[PDB]
Amino acid sequence: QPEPDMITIFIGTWNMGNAPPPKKITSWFLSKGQGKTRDDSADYIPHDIYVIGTQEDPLSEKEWLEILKHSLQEITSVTFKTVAIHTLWNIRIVVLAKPEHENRISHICTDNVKTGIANTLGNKGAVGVSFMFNGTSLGFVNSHLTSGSEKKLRRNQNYMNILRFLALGDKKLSPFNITHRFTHLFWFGDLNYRVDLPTWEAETIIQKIKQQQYADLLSHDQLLTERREQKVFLHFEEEEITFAPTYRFERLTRDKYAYTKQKATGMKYNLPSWCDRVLWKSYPLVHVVCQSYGSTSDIMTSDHSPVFATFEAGVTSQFVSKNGPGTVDSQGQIEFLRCYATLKTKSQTKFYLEFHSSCLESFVKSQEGENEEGSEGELVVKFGETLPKLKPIISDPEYLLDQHILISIKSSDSDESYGEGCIALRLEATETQLPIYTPLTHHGELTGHFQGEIKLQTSQ
Ligand SMILES: Cc1nc(CN2CCC(CN)CC2)cs1
């Protein structure tokens, strides 16, 4: 049986509004309803991995797992295996996989982050799961961020606390947060960003939704505008939204949005909004294609509608040569030429690099770079041709061209990372000097850039 080079992944997010689900929720897993929906001809074809995020989930883990497994069994006639389940308060993530994948999946991690302090600590935060699927690392985050139209900045803060403190993936990747630890990272949930239009315009917004005219609403969606201004989710993707706002509905129908202020809402308006979202970030030049992104129309127990997204995701096999794992393949090398980092920092420490990659036996520390002043104020750290030649464990080009090098630029004084980025080895040529580039981030914010040339030697 050949190892796959592509899998499909289902992502669901549903704020259940503290209510039990209805008896049938199959439309969710079938990507049926509004938006970018899945073809009927695919209904019986199981996805490889199903990742279900709930918020305001009133069920026990056992109760929800029985519902999910029953649902998938009905659709696919396959009995899925539980990879992981993790709950923080009423925020939950379940990962299910086809049984043929059970011995492809390893290094399963779970974690949670509680957001806020005192007043604001006790119900918002995130849960996450990571694992390896053969040679590919996969990470999944379900977050329930702060509510309320006038709290976008708090949501942005919640995002940065989650990506800083969620401890998933390979702990040896110490300089890297979750936004660099995975080949594919999916981040979804009740992100709680709202359509920022005046309260007076509620009925106008409703009219627009009934006409399926979302353009003038999406131009005011706080998540799209904050992302465009680089305030949140830097270097993440989201499919175009083509489904109606998923919040706030009257329960037991989808005919009415319940937007007016009530004691139950703390006297806050809930104008129709796209609270419920799926975003992703994959390493450069890895295959990832969104094949559905929408909301169900027939699941009406909550004041939110479920959201689905599905993806094709490239995966690689667990490579064994005669040499690596457990020795180098002298036929292989990575040379970083004429490299320099441009940093936004005002500090004047010396810097060194660390190169991390599962194609290396362990991470590689460079010598300190040479600091110069950029013409527009910046720090430029030059490494010249001084950088250590990296010796991958396997030289086979079918393996090496699919790998990535994580780079951290660290202060000599403090050993703290000032910036993190990633370089693909999916080059246009081997044994050839080629330009490379990554932005550098720290705590998910832009801190600089790294650029130069690479020369990759494989066994071919
Ligand atoms: C929130 C926004 N980000 C962009 C830039 N990105 C647009 C898509 C592109 C991938 N084809 C990567 C860069 C414009 S608005």
By the 10 Å C-beta count (0-12 exposed, 13-18 middle, 19+ buried), 28 is classed as buried
- Token reading at 201: 């315009």
Closest to 419 in 3D by CA, of 352, 361, 362: 352
* Rounded-to-integer distance, Cα 440 and Cα 340, Å: 12
Q: If you measure from the C-alpha of residue 303 to the centroid of ligand 1, how many angstroms do you get, rounded to a whole number? A: 31
Query: Whose alpha carbon is nearest atom 5 of ligand 1?
Result: 228
Find out whether the beta carbon of 229 lies less than 6 Å from any atom of ligand 1.
no
Q: Is 277 left (phi over 0), alpha (psi -120 to 50) or beta?
A: beta
Resolution in Å, one decimal place: 1.4
d(CA 33, CA 211): 16
Residue nearest to atom 10 of ligand 1 (CA): 237
Is any ligand 1 atom within 6 A of the Cβ of residue 228? yes
Is the CB of 281 inside a 6 Å radius of any atom of ligand 1? no
Collapsing DSSP to helix, strand or coil, 262 comes out as coil
Measured between alpha carbons, how far is residue 413 from residues 150, 207, 347, 349 in Å?
A: 41, 59, 11, 6
Q: How many other C-beta atoms can be found within 10 angstroms of the C-beta atom of residue 255? A: 9
Residue by residue, DSSP assigns 170-217 as -TT-TT--HHHH-SEEEEEEE----B---GGGHHHHHHHHHTT--HHH
Residue nearest to atom 3 of ligand 1 (CA): 228
Q: Which long-range contacts (CB under 8 A, 24 or more apart) does 102-106 make?
A: 104/3, 104/133, 104/134, 105/131, 105/132, 105/133, 106/131, 106/132
Tell me how far apart the alpha carbons of residues 157 and 145 are, in angstroms, rounded to a whole number: 9
> Which amino acid, residue 358?
S
Distance 228 CA to ligand 1 centre (A): 8
E strands, 344-444, where? 351-356, 364-365, 370-373, 379-384, 404-411, 417-424, 434-442
The Cα 103–Cα 133 span in angstroms is 9
- Confirm or reject: Cβ of 62 under 6 Å from ligand 1: no
3-state secondary structure of 23: coil
- Could you tell me which residues are beta bridge partners of residue 195? 221
- Residue 227 CA, closest ligand 1 atom number: 1
- Are 212 and 186 within 8 A, CB to CB? no
Q: Specify the ligand 1 atom closest to the Cα of 233.
A: 1
β-pairing verdict for 333-343 and 445-457:
antiparallel
Ligand 1 closest atom vs CA 238: 1
Could you tell me the distance, in angstroms and rounded to a whole number, from the CA of residue 458 to the centre of ligand 1?
33
Q: How many CB atoms lie within 10 A of CB 154?
A: 18
Q: State the closest ligand 1 atom to the C-alpha of 228, by its place in the atom list counted from 1.
A: 1
Closest residue by Cα to atom 8, ligand 1, is 237
Helices and strands: H and E segment counts in the chain = 8, 21
Measured from the CB, is residue 227 less than 6 Å from ligand 1?
yes
Report yes or no: 297 and 33 within 8 Å, Cβ to Cβ: yes
Which of 229, 231, 237, 288 is the best mutation target for the ligand 1 pocket, counting ligand atoms within 8 Å of the beta carbon and taking the most? 237
Residue whose token pair is 């708090």: 154
CA–CA dist 185, 195 (Å, integer): 26
Q: Whose CA is nearest to atom 15 of ligand 1?
A: 228
Ligand 1 pocket test target in 223, 228, 281 with most atoms within 8 Å of CB? 228
For residue 266, report the distance from its CA to the centre of ligand 1, in Å. Answer: 36
Q: How far is the CA of 312 from the centre of ligand 1 (A)?
A: 20
| Angstrom distance (rounded) from CA 166 to CA 385 | 36
Say how many residues make up the chain.
460
- CA 235 to centroid of ligand 1, rounded, Å: 8
Distance 40 CA to ligand 1 centre (A): 31
- Closest by CA to 95, choosing from 148, 45, 132, 58, is 132
